[PDB]
Structure 1
């Protein structure tokens, strides 16, 4: 079983990694084993003097703080977003663009970006007067919480994976991680995409053919959109993966809708299992959210992401074909 797991982890640089198989083969530790593999692949332990036992201890505690009883926003989703960000960071158009600290920030942000997610939306938490919404003043409620948990866990016994960074490195990393995770709030998507489109329309490329990003605002914007794309990457994956993600998000949505129905609340979009169209909802998700975003990312890194965009378009056609 360990041999099979190691073989599967050889695919860590590939879009379409068998992340559900890795979750089972690793004993429900996909986030730990995928993060560890990526840190080794990128030489991050040596670069940042991260003791291996500290990394494993932190990763296992972080993974434990994802809810094993939530169908979508669990440790498998976190592992998938980590690995997807890892692939996007390796795109030819970004070669030598980001520092080791920025790479570390994007990967760490991906790992923590949904930690302790309860399986219900920000709006549900606001409308039910939850403790989380009271703590965070209705403003990026979940995303503020994910950050606070992900950072607080570094303070547990033998968990400070950043113990050997300089003070300036720790300060810079913390700010970048906050900026990245807060950009995963879906209420920020339209403004984030509008800004990415502006960057594409005005993009500068160096003599080596890579993106020129010469200020913090542009650098963090690219990292924010990269992790947002990874977060919204399910419809761009091979169909057998995509369909499993759809099954999982629908289960989580339907459970939220059942709670809304019981409380006499209006049921959130796509959350009413008695009036659902799973297939039309995927086509709409792609047409209005995922394709606009991925077509723009593909333009930023053209032509690096053409195969990913082609898969997204094929999957849209497939879901559309099930409707009639």
Structure 2
């Protein structure tokens, strides 16, 4: 009731910045997340006991894969927190409530394999969900955990507010399917530029929350260079394991997933920053000006990858 979560001073200050790294002490990640809910949403958004129990069941349903793990979930939530704290007044109480939960849950029970490997292996999830295979799984895992006893953090919401928040969470989690990102950012580009973009148009809000989700999900490219470079090793550890699995099915993987083509990583990251990251943070900064530090950090990391290619590191 009178119970604030507080962090040590360096964390209390640095958590407010976009480039914050949540650190290697796993047992602090739940308290970091509660801290962000309390400041973002309020000390009364959730019953603490239900929230704590929800966080620990979410944590237990992330697997120990190199990249798509519990650390990625809390990292993507921290980026969302920074966005919401720098754009206070643009977001409903339900959106604040739902989006941090969406980020924490967005990769639930990930196995370190793409939608594309599931379809080729013919995994049961690919017959249950023909598109956004893993992302429909993540949402379904979210609803499951929410329906466990004493886990309903949304218990105090009205019936219709409940249905609204679960609909925000669903669209937020679906939007993390990067295949959907390209069309969504193109449409937001055009709507912003012709001056049609309208935040009272719910279907416009949806697209903007979609773009934030892509931004939070890729936020590893906006960290300090050593964080960005070491996270890339985890990202490629998964891609190469998937490449190995492709070869086991008799399929030559794309070069991104072929550990034999390790040497071209620098050039591959460059393509990824130019094709995906830069456009994403450009359009996001256009629509939400206080998110510009994400664009600036992304550009500093692209420059670090250029430096790697030129032999300067």
Q: Same fold (TM over 0.5)?
A: yes
Task: Measure how far apart 1:213 and its partner are.
Answer: 1.4
Q: Of the candidates 109, 114, 125, which is equivalent to residue 107 of structure 2? A: 114
Q: Is the 8 A contact 1:78 1:112 kept in 2?
A: yes
Contact 1:8/1:18 (<8 A) preserved? no
Structure 1 residue 8: Cα displacement: 5.1
Larger proportion of helix: 2
CA distance in 2 between partners of 1:79 and 1:167 (Å): 28
Q: 2:32 aligns with which of 31, 34, 52?
A: 34
Is the contact made by 2:270 and 2:302 (CA closer than 8 Å) also made in structure 1? yes
Separation in 1, partners of 2:295, 2:281: 7
8 A contact 1:67–1:116 mirrored in 2: yes
For 1:4 and 1:320, the matched residues in 2 are separated by 40
Please report the RMSD computed on the Cα atoms of aligned residues, expressed in angstroms: 2.0
- What's the secondary structure of 1:83's corresponding residue? helix
Q: Distance in 1 between matches of 2:6 and 2:255?
A: 41
Aligned partner of 2:73 in structure 1 is 78
Q: Distance in 1 between matches of 2:115 and 2:167?
A: 23
- Unmatched 5+ stretches in structure 2: none
Equivalent in the alignment of 2:60: 64
Judge conservation of contact 1:97–1:212 (CA < 8 Å) in 2.
no
Contact kept in structure 1, 2:172 and 2:209, CA below 8 Å: yes
Separation (CA, whole Å) in 2 of partners of 1:8 and 1:127: 47
Match of 1:260 in 2: 246
Aligned pairs for 1:1-324 within 5 A = 6-7=8-9, 9-10=11-12, 11-19=14-22, 21=23, 24-27=24-27, 30=29, 32-46=30-44, 48=45, 50-68=46-64, 70-91=65-86, 94-136=87-129, 138-203=130-195, 213-276=199-262, 277-302=264-289, 304-324=290-310
- Does the 8 Å contact 1:283/1:316 carry over to 2? yes
Residue 207 of structure 1 corresponds to none
**For the residues of structure 1 that align with 2:252 and 2:135, how far apart are their CA atoms?**
24
Q: Contact 2:21 / 2:223 at 8 angstroms: preserved in 1?
A: no
Q: Which deviates further from its counterpart, 183-192 or 195-204? A: 195-204
Which aligned segments of 4 or more residues in structure 1 are displaced greater than 6 angstroms? Answer: none
- Looking at structure 1, the residues matched to 41 and 132 of structure 2 have their Cα atoms a distance apart, in angstroms, of 33
Long gaps (5+) in structure 1: 205-210
Aligned residues: 304
Contact 1:44 1:104 (8 Å CA) reproduced: no
Instruction: Tell me if the contact between 1:119 and 1:252 (Cα under 8 Å) persists in the aligned partners.
Output: yes
TM-score, normalising length: structure 1: 0.88
Give the aligned partner of residue 208 of structure 1: none
State the Cα distance separating 1:99 from its structure 2 match: 0.8
Cα deviation for residue 295 of structure 1 reads 1.0
